[model samples]
Target: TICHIQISKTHGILKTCEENSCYKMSVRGWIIGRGCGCPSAVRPRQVQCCTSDKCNY
Candidate 1:
């Protein structure tokens, strides 16, 4: 089995014209043989952005 997870946030847009878009992180965890075994079975294998933007400091 596999479980999917996602996290995101939206901030002010560039030039204050373009609408704010989502910033996200996604991951998939594979279940090894079932029921809440241990922490090792669930790991963060990947992290990626769903949209493009420049974060100004």
Candidate 2:
């Protein structure tokens, strides 16, 4: 694996986060020390992956 990716999302009481369930998203890529996907308050409006720990933050 070129990168160890971790994903996160902002959501409501039900914890309806995009981070909740998704498998195919495990896809990897080059580009060290970072990830994608900007979180949203209302809908799961995804903006965008990662490497090197919490760099995904």
Candidate 3:
């Protein structure tokens, strides 16, 4: 018998912009929405996805 399972890892930096400041969040896993639902006045930066263990923000 043969059984095979596939696993994957994803990493990226989620940039969030607020009224007066910005944040850089280190995320590890499958990212959804891609930084959506942000304030209309504030423009949310898209997440830069990578397949590596580390992401340089």
Candidate 4:
């Protein structure tokens, strides 16, 4: 069996050249194995989501 889901957000407080430059970003939604196609011992299926906004410091 394999299942995965992820959501993230990052904003505000940034200096030193914008800390690698990443202001206001977002992504939310990820699903797998719902269609029944994961049975290889379920080792490392992958899922990642993120979001961010509002920053002025």
Candidate 5:
């Protein structure tokens, strides 16, 4: 599927992945990232996942 993609980037973009979901996450109160993933989230920061094209947006 297609999803928004970014990692330590000043801007966000898009990508096509073999996976079925998209994710947006901020790690440890810094370094935000977005990508494709069909998993769960857990931690001191924030993480979100969705199951649609560019759903990470």
Candidate 6:
């Protein structure tokens, strides 16, 4: 008998806008840790997106 394991890589992109300019932000950890309406045991910390006059995430 043999066992097989599969590995995958995750990619992400973040964009920020300030002072009429656009820039890219860096992500360091899990992006989708939790969702809304989950119990406290599973609730993820709220992450806020960069605010500006150009884009929103």
Candidates' lDDT values, in order? 0.26, 0.28, 0.29, 0.25, 0.77, 0.28
Residue 37, candidate 6: C-alpha displacement in angstroms:
18
Error of 5 at 30 (Å): 5.4
* TM-scores for all predictions: 0.16, 0.18, 0.20, 0.16, 0.70, 0.19
lDDT (Cα, tens digit) per residue for candidate 4, span 1-57: 211212235323233332222222122323331211222322345422222222211
lDDT of 6 by residue, 1-57 (tens): 111111235333332322332222223534333111212222343333323433322
Minimal lDDT window, size 10, model 2: 18-27
TM-score computed on alpha carbons, candidate 5: 0.70
Summarize candidate 5's per-residue lDDT along 1-57 as a digit string, tens digits: 798878453466688999988887877766477887855656866888788987887
Find the candidate with the highest TM-score and give its number. 5
Task: Output the worst ten-in-a-row residue range by lDDT, candidate 1.
Answer: 32-41
lDDT string for model 1 (1-57, tens) is 112222124333233213333222224533212111112212363322222234211
- State, as a TM-score between 0 and 1, how close model 6 is to the true structure: 0.19
Which pairs clash (backbone N, Cα, C closer than 3 Å) in model 6?
Answer: none
Q: Residues 1-57, candidate 2: write the lDDT tens digits.
A: 122244345322121233422111311432222233333322232222322223233
Q: What lDDT score goes with residue 31 in model 2?
A: 24
Tens digits of per-residue lDDT, candidate 3, 1-57, equal: 111111235444344322222212223543233332222222333344333222222
The candidate that wins on lDDT is 5
Give the CA lDDT, 0 to 100, for residue 26 in model 2.
19
On TM-score, the stronger of 3 and 4 is 3
